């Protein structure tokens, strides 16, 4: 179908823009006492989980649109939202302005992950 | 006779009030009729086959709701009530709603206070049009306030 081909390009393109790695902050006896580490650890922990979920969902959609895995109920719900351009409710994990569409969320989500990577990189290389 | 619609007893009371009013010229107002879209269709059919008293009037109060039947809308005359278009229209509506004897009581300074209240009420309500800048939220500053 026409939608099946168009959605395949969009999902593959989104996997290019969205980053792929997010390393959790290493908890340390003196890092727990640091308030900045405590807040920043939450950001990556909730950020890493959201990053993996979106990438896995997008990869399944690409594989579905290549006719390699069968469409499940979750994929049917996700694919319907992506065709209509509505941001999936599963992806919605941080507060966003009302009326934000899926194309803006992917670009917004990609920027947030980059900042999350830099924060973890500083903690990994240099310390908290 | 004013009747709220939601109750089952309200439906029975509405029919009796309407039946009595169409023979005496009495006025009947039914409020929140958008809460009973199914009963509204039956009321439209009831009104069609009826030749009431020349002074009889039926008022239906509803929110602007897509649930209201089209057939009822065509049978009646629609009046939209909404925020006044601007500051001038807001203040003219206020001065018409308040009786003249109310403003013109013994203290002569009462008139200027009502004007200040009317101006203040117009400015506050008109800022709602600027959803975010006028007020952070869409407060329901209204006639009760």
């Amino acid at each position: 179908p026409a939608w099946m081909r168009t959605l395949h390009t969009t999902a593959s393109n989104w996997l290019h823009l969205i980053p792929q790695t997010l390393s959790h902050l290493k908890r340390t006896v003196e890092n727990i006492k640091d308030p900045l580490f405590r807040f920043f650890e939450r950001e990556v922990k909730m950020g890493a989980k959201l990053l993996q979920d979106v990438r896995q969902d997008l990869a399944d959609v690409v594989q579905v649109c290549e006719g390699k895995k069968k469409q499940t109920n979750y994929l049917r719900t996700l694919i319907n939202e992506l065709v209509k351009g509505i941001l999936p409710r599963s992806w919605s994990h941080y507060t966003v302005p009302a009326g934000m569409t899926v194309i803006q969320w992917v670009s917004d989500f990609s920027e947030r992950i980059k900042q999350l990577q830099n924060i973890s990189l500083a903690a990994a290389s240099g310390g908290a | 006779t004013s009747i709220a619609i939601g109750s089952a007893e309200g439906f029975n009371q509405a029919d009796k009030a309407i039946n009595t009013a169409v023979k005496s010229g009495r006025w009947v107002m039914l409020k929140n009729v958008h809460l009973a879209p199914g009963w509204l269709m039956q009321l439209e059919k009831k009104l069609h086959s009826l030749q009431p008293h020349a002074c009889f009037r039926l008022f239906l109060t509803m929110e602007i709701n897509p649930k209201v039947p089209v057939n009822l809308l065509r049978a009646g005359r629609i009046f939209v009530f909404e925020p006044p278009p601007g500051v001038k229209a807001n203040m003219l509506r206020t001065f018409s709603s308040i009786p003249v004897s109310r403003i013109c009581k013994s203290p002569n300074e009462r008139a200027r206070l009502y004007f200040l209240l009317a101006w203040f009420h117009a400015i506050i309500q008109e800022r709602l049009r600027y959803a975010p800048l006028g007020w952070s939220k869409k407060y329901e500053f209204g006639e009760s306030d």
Partner: protein, 1622 residues
């Protein structure tokens, strides 16, 4: 002979114990001593039960069993007698003390007289022989009481209108339930029974003080013991009737308080504007007067001082005496602060806390007045304050006190409030007071709105208590309708009480509009009081409520509190909103509340503590991780602050307790000097916040604690006494107990944490994933507290989502307005009534199930400080202190903040329950509990030793479990589903060894053989328990992983998976292929429904099903539709006799009521001494409920399937609640088997993890190409023995069948159309169809065989296709497949495209020419016009094919049709025409605008009687338009699949059906007399005679949705896509 002594003692006790009799008003001799009777009977019942365990019980077994029967009969009699005597007492009082009721209800009065006669006659017999045994032997005494109880209940329910008349005479009765009101009215002479009801009619009156006679009411008392002595006592003798002296008591309460206020104001004025206050005099004045008057007196004195000071400052430049007003407050507050620094009586200490809170506000207001340089009493900054003016010269004592705020003026109601905890008077609370009092002056309602936990409800009550008003809180829901709200208003208006309706937006929008009329008319009446022209000596103000003229007291008010941010709530109509003044309460002033509360409790560093605790809660909300069970709001802060005062008091008591045994240096002042106040606060935080934390947040919060409270350490009390009892309870329950880091230590900490929450909260939640030890944590704690404290613990476990919300809380009758209790309401009311001493026991109500806002928000007033269950009938049930409300849940993803903030949280993680602990529990039970009902235990014990090495941590099972979670499973994988399956299989292995010993009585299995068997069976059990729900590739992969890590010997085959091997009883691996013979099937059983061709999968699945079924373990078969789940289950049941299967077909609309109808037909409810037991009617049989679509039932918006919760309850709790009588029913000999499609399929929902832990899942896939060749190659060989000349073509015929079926299954899928499901069911129909066309044939050429093969392929694969391209592909590939497998055949004679078969032109079903068929149909249509329907039809080619297709289905048993096409295409007409050709009667339901569900049920009964009893072949033709309700198809879904509807025939209909079935079976020559036998024959007749034709238009959305509503339409009906005319 110790047993003989017990029998002698039991015999001697009951040979002398007499019913203790008391005369009752010279009418009879009632029975007291119910506690003595019941405990004595229970004690002997336990002793008789306990002595059975003794080995010497055999000699005295008969005598003990005789006493067990007698003691049980004593219990069953006097448990009814007590309720009968109680009800007769107050009914006799009503039907004697009110002669008006005889005229009002003559029938009831005469009926009560007859019952009152039989009661008194039975009383006189008891008087003659008060011995219990003599009473127990009275003829029919058990049945006499049973009739008396039922008859007295009918009289009780018939007095409702009489009770509504009495409620007017004392309007506080409007807030009392009907039964309690009858107790009040009927016991008007027995005043002691009235005490428990005063808390319902009064704000703070818990009891009344009476003289020795009980004839004069001396005063009133509160629940805390505070007493008010009336100045003029009320005599009951001079005013005998209940409603007049109750009115006089209510008046004297107001008059005495006003008189007491005047005396208090006189004394407190000396303290005001005084330089120095002596503490002894001030404490004396506090102790002399009531708590409400003490604070009121302080407010009056302060107000008059400010008025006096401001009056002197009239000149402006005059000196300010306001500083003296501040000075007096400073001095008085210092004395109050000093008093609370030392020990005080509990009542005085609370009074001091109230005064400190009041004066801190007065200090703040006076400071604000001084800072703002206010010098005039008419300044608004003083007028905006709440002021208190007292006029001693006023003649009426009730009007001496005036409370004024801005322009609003109020009288004090002088309602006795007792000792109500006061709020800290914060700026938000000040703003709340100003706004609400403005609404009260405007005669408008107050509408505080905001998020949860902001003080909305408490502020309304605080304002009401400030004004001395009776404030009633109602927890509103959707059941608060127009009639319920109006009746509540009637009570509020006449009493003069305030109505605070919380969660007011939970009403329906239509009800909110209707209620606005009642609110408006009351408000107009309220303005009539405010009219100066109106005079008090005139007609009372009255408004019309519920079409009645109701007097309105000026003191009444209406308040609504709502959270406008909650989604799903009802929007208030504007006409209702204009009746209320709204105030936003969003940000409570937490630091001020904390500072004042800690300062009032006696903390010297309250300012330091408040500046730390409030930011600490803010930090926790942000620094800690985000969890749904996390709350750090004002309720959490309030809980810690209140707990801080309790912890401070216990330490002070502990410090001096150490001082008693160490010297005599009690120096309380110095004791408070060296008191670790910060450490006290940390203990309260940790006792309340820590149990809710996940593991990774625990170190975070302690780092935060060290950040805000440096150098302060938390140390739990080492609770040796409780831990010792817990350790013993764990041993008796086969549980693992640990201490610290030992095995089970984490779980024991959670048990101790749960105990701490029980002591601080009356409502708490245990939250954690399924299998976290939550249930065992509170079940063990309940038993441990019984042993530790001596208090019996009782748990009522409720599944709230297994029943409707109507059945949980109750319903108000729409017409009679009668209230029926729900499950929770009945349980709580039983505890409050305390007929059998429920108030002396620990009562835990555990809601084990899903939490959603729809039902739990009815408990908002229960879980908060109100502790009240409010019902729409106006009744309010107080939570007794011995009751805990508990919620055991797996998640809180749908609970709102309102619920989470009101409950103590104990979080369980899956790490709390370690896998080692579960292994220990299974092994401990295996070594102690015999499986037979010891040679069986000896086998288990030896087997336990063999299994022990593999069940250690990091053992074989642990490593296998970890690897299994990495694999893909058809359902979500949980640890306990695997282990539950694994332990069931190992129990079967122990039974196998015992069964072997039965077969070999000479040589029982030795340890070497026993060891050799168990290790291989364990490996076998591990594979099926961990991969039986996965595909073959995943089952294989777990095999190699086990092969690497195990040391158990394994099969040495090179490429054969381990899952392909069983374990023989000789401890040898044996291939499963040895049990798969190549059978030859009898030629008449070809593709019959009961015939199973043995394959590798069938023998393995049957053996696995046998193990689970033989253990009565619930199980689910999952697989694609048609994969053999029903076939495998029924095949396994044949090898398992003594088990009856009953098939239930779930739909999207399936509710638990479908299960209940099955119980009504196959099972009986019987009363046993231990409760109601539900068991199958047939004895010695285990009844199996087979649910075919267990995962179709609709999931609500909160992720719950009601029937699934109901099944989980019956499996895990072994029963359910009977909603008619709110009685627990225990299941016996009932097991459950589920079948379903994979949850990823459309319409299918994932099963709850709490249900899956009990239910092992086996995955049944479609047979592969080789398995299909083996199955239907066997069938084809048998069916081709009819024609010996066609034997050679068996293999090519099977190969063509498999090839085309596989191609069609790939070509057409559910993605294209929802009904494109191809399964081996089509293969079975394919072979059957050819076989039916070959039986009457003596010979046939091979080309004739291909034509039948091609014809059946078109009927099975092409008739459901929607598109012409799809039908073209099927037509072409039938030719391609046939010639590929059948060369050297004449294509034209075998594959001529018009393939038509009919038995209309001959005796046999042989091919028919199209033109010959057309002439025959025209000839028959001519007759059809003249006999049935004179509607001429034009005959085209598609009609001829269609009528042949319909004719085929009408000639098959259970032949159901799903005709899909455009309206007006002839679907109904052709069906009737073919039905007339086959002798089938046509039945169509005669719908109309008023056709309802019970009309459809009666129509269903008519068709079933004709086809089931009269042997009448019926074509039941029904269109989609005939479906006027979804309930129509729930009946048809059962009828299509099972040929029966379990609940259709009930009562007289079933009795008439049995008479007709007996007559019908007699005409057939069958010998049937049993009702069960008759019903089975009736079902078999419906199966063979009733044909259902369903016609519907093609709708893509409708067709897909149709599958869930009626799955039988797509798997039990043959679908023919007629579509539109081409």
């Amino acid at each position: 002979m110790a047993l003989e002594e017990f029998l002698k003692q039991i015999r001697e006790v009951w040979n002398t114990y007499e019913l203790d009799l008391v005369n009752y008003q010279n009418k009879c001799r009632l029975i007291r001593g119910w506690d003595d009777l019941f405990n004595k009977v229970k004690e002997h019942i336990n002793s008789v039960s306990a002595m059975k365990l003794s080995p010497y019980y055999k000699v005295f077994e008969e005598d003990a069993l005789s006493w067990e029967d007698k003691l049980n009969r004593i219990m069953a009699l006097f448990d009814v007698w007590i309720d009968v005597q109680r009800r007769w007492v107050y009914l006799e009082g009503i039907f004697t003390g009110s002669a008006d009721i005889k005229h009002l209800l003559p029938v009831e009065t005469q009926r009560f007289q007859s019952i009152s006669t039989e009661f008194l006659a039975l009383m006189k017999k008891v008087s003659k022989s008060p011995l219990v045994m003599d009473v127990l032997n009275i003829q029919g005494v058990q049945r006499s009481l049973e009739r008396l109880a039922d008859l007295l209940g009918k009289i009780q329910k018939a007095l409702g209108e009489y009770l509504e008349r009495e409620r007017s005479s004392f309007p506080r009765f409007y807030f009392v339930g009907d039964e309690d009101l009858l107790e009040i009215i009927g016991n008007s002479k027995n005043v002691a029974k009235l005490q428990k009801h005063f808390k319902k009619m009064f704000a703070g009156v818990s009891s009344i003080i009476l003289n020795e006679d009980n004839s004069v009411v001396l005063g009133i008392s509160s629940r805390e013991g505070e007493e008010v002595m009336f100045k003029t006592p009320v005599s009951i003798t001079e005013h005998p009737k209940i409603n007049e002296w109750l009115t006089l008591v209510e008046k004297e309460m107001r008059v005495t308080l006003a008189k007491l206020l005047a005396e208090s104001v006189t004394e407190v004025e000396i303290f005001g504007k005084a330089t120095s206050i002596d503490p002894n005099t001030y404490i004396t004045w506090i102790d002399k007067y009531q708590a409400q008057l003490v604070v009121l007196s302080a407010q009056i004195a302060w107000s008059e001082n400010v008025e006096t000071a401001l009056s002197s400052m009239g000149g402006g430049g005059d000196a300010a005496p306001l500083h003296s007003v501040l000075s007096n407050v400073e001095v008085t507050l210092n004395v109050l602060a000093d008093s609370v620094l030392m020990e005080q009586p509990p009542l005085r200490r609370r009074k001091l806390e109230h005064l400190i809170t009041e004066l801190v506000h007065q200090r703040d207001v006076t400071r604000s007045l001084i800072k703002s340089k206010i010098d005039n009493a008419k300044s608004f900054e003083w007028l905006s304050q709440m002021r208190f003016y007292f006029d001693p010269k006023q003649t009426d004592v009730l009007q001496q006190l005036s409370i004024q705020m801005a322009n609003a003026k109020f009288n004090y109601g002088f309602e006795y409030l007792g000792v109500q905890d006061k709020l800290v008077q914060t700026p938000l609370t000040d703003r709340c007071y100003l706004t609400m009092t403005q609404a009260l002056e405007a005669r408008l309602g107050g509408s505080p709105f905001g998020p949860a936990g902001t003080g909305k409800t408490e502020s309304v009550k605080a304002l009401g208590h400030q004004l001395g008003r009776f404030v009633l809180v109602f927890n509103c829901d959707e059941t608060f309708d127009f009639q319920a709200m109006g009746r509540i208003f009637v009570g509020l208006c006449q009493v003069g009480a305030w109505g605070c309706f919380d969660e007011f937006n939970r009403l329906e929008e239509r009800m909110l509009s209707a209620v606005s009329q009642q609110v408006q008319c009351i408000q107009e009446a309220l303005r009539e009081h405010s009219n100066p022209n109106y005079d008090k000596t005139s007609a009372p103000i009255t408004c019309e409520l519920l079409n009645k003229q109701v007097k309105v007291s000026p003191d009444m008010a209406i308040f609504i509190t709502m959270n406008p941010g909650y989604a799903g709530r009802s929007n208030l109509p504007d006409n209702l909103k204009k009746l209320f003044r709204s105030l936003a309460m969003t940000k409570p002033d937490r630091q001020l509340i904390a500072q004042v509360m800690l300062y009032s409790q006696g903390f010297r560093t309250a300012e330091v503590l408040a500046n730390k605790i409030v930011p600490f809660f803010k930090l926790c909300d942000e620094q800690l991780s985000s969890q749904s069970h996390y709350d750090f709001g004002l309720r959490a802060l309030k809980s810690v602050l209140v707990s801080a005062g309790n912890v401070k008091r216990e330490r002070i008591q502990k410090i001096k307790r150490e001082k008693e045994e160490r010297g005599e240096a009690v120096d309380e002042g110095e004791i408070a000097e060296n008191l670790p106040e910060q450490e006290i606060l940390i203990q309260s935080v940790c006792e309340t916040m820590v149990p809710k934390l996940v593991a990774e947040d625990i170190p975070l919060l302690f780092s935060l604690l060290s950040d805000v409270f440096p150098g302060v350490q938390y140390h739990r009390g080492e609770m040796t006494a409780l831990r010792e009892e817990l350790k013993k309870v764990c041993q008796e329950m086969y549980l693992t107990y640990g201490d610290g880091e030992e095995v089970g230590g984490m779980w024991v900490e959670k048990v101790l944490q749960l105990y701490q929450i029980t002591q601080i909260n009356h409502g708490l939640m245990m939250v954690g994933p399924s299998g976290s030890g939550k249930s065992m944590a509170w079940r063990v704690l309940l038993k441990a507290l019984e042993r530790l404290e001596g208090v019996e613990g009782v748990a009522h476990i409720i599944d709230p989502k297994a029943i409707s919300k109507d059945h949980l809380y109750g319903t108000l009758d729409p017409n009679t307005r009668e209230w029926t209790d729900g499950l929770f309401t009945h349980v709580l009311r039983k505890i409050i009534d305390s007929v059998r001493g429920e108030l002396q026991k620990r009562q835990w109500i555990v809601f084990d199930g899903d939490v959603d806002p729809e039902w739990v928000e009815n408990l908002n007033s229960v879980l908060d400080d109100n502790k009240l269950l409010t019902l729409p009938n106006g009744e309010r049930l107080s939570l007794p202190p011995n009751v805990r409300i508990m919620f055991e849940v797996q998640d809180l993803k749908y609970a709102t903040l309102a619920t989470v903030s009101r409950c103590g949280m104990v979080w369980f993680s899956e790490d709390v329950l370690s896998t080692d602990m579960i292994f220990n529990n299974f092994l401990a039970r295996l070594r102690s509990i015999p499986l037979d009902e010891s040679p069986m235990l000896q086998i288990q014990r030896d087997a336990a030793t063999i299994m022990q090495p593999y069940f250690t941590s990091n053992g074989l099972v642990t490593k296998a479990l970890e690897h299994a979670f990495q694999l893909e499973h058809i359902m979500d994988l949980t640890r306990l589903r695997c282990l539950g399956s694994l332990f069931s299989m190992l129990h079967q292995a122990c039974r196998n060894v015992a069964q072997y010993n039965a077969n070999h009585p000479d040589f029982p299995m030795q340890i070497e053989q026993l060891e050799r068997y168990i290790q291989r069976y364990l490996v076998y059990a591990i594979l099926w328990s961990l991969s039986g729900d996965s595909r073959l590739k995943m089952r294989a992969e777990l095999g190699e992983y086990i092969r690497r890590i195990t040391t158990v010997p394994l099969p040495t085959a090179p490429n054969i998976p381990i899952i392909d091997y069983e374990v023989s009883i000789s401890g040898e691996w044996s291939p499963w292929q040895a049990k798969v013979p190549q059978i030859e099937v009898e030629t008449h059983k070809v593709a019959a429904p009961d015939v199973v061709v043995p394959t590798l999968d069938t023998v393995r699945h049957e053996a696995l099903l046998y193990t689970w079924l033989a253990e009565h373990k619930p199980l689910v078969l999952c697989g694609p539709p048609g994969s053999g789940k029903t076939m495998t289950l029924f095949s396994a049941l044949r090898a398992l006799p003594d088990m009856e299967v009953v098939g239930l077909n779930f739909s999207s609309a399936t509710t638990p009521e479908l299960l209940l109808k099955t119980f009504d037909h196959y099972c009986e409810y019987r009363r046993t001494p231990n409760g109601v037991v539900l068991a199958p009617v047939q004895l010695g049989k285990w009844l199996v409920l087979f649910c075919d679509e267990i995962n179709l039932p609709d999931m609500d918006k909160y992720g719950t399937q009601r029937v699934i919760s109901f099944i989980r309850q019956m499996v895990e709790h072994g029963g359910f609640y009977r909603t008619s009588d709110q009685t627990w029913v225990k299941l016996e000999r009932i097991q459950f088997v589920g079948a379903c499609n994979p949850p990823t399929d459309p319409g299918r929902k994932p099963l709850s993890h709490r249900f899956l832990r009990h239910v092992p899942v086996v995955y049944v896939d479609y047979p592969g190409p080789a398995s299909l060749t083996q199955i239907y190659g066997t069938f084809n060989r048998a069916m081709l023995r009819l024609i010996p000349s066609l034997r050679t073509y068996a293999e090519p015929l099977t190969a063509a069948m498999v090839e085309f079926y596989t191609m069609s299954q790939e070509r057409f899928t559910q993605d294209t159309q929802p009904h494109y499901i191809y399964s081996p069911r089509e293969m079975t129909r394919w072979v059957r169809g050819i076989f039916e066309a070959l039986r009457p044939l003596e010979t046939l050429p091979v080309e004739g065989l291909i034509r039948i093969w091609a014809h059946e392929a078109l009927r099975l694969f092409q008739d459901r296709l929607v598109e012409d391209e799809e039908r073209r592909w099927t037509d072409e590939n039938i030719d391609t497949v046939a010639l590929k497998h059948f060369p050297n055949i004449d294509r034209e004679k075998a594959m001529s495209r018009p393939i038509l078969y009919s038995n209309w032109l001959s005796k046999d079903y042989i091919p028919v020419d199209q033109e010959e068929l057309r002439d025959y149909v025209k000839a028959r249509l001519k007759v059809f016009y003249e006999e049935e329907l004179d509607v001429p039809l034009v005959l085209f080619n598609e009609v001829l094919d269609h009528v042949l297709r319909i004719d085929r289905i009408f000639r098959q048993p259970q032949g159901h049709l799903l005709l899909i096409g455009v309206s007006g295409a002839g679907k109904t007409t052709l069906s009737r025409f073919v039905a007339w050709m086959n002798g089938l009667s046509v039945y169509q339901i005669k719908v109309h605008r008023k056709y309802t569900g019970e009309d459809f049920d009666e129509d269903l009964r008519t068709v079933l009687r004709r086809s089931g009893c009269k042997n009448e072949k019926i074509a039941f033709i029904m269109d989609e338009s005939n479906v006027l309700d979804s309930g129509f198809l729930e009946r048809m879904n059962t009828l299509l699949a099972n040929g029966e509807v379990p609940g259709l025939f009930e009562g007289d209909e079933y009795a008439t059906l049995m008479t007709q079935c007996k007559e019908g079976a007699q005409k057939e020559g069958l010998m049937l007399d049993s009702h069960e036998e008759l019903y089975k024959w009736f079902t078999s007749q419906v199966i063979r005679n009733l044909h259902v034709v369903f016609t519907m238009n093609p709708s893509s959305e409708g067709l897909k949705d149709r599958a869930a509503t009626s799955p039988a339409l797509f798997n039990r009906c043959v679908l023919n896509w007629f579509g539109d005319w081409s």
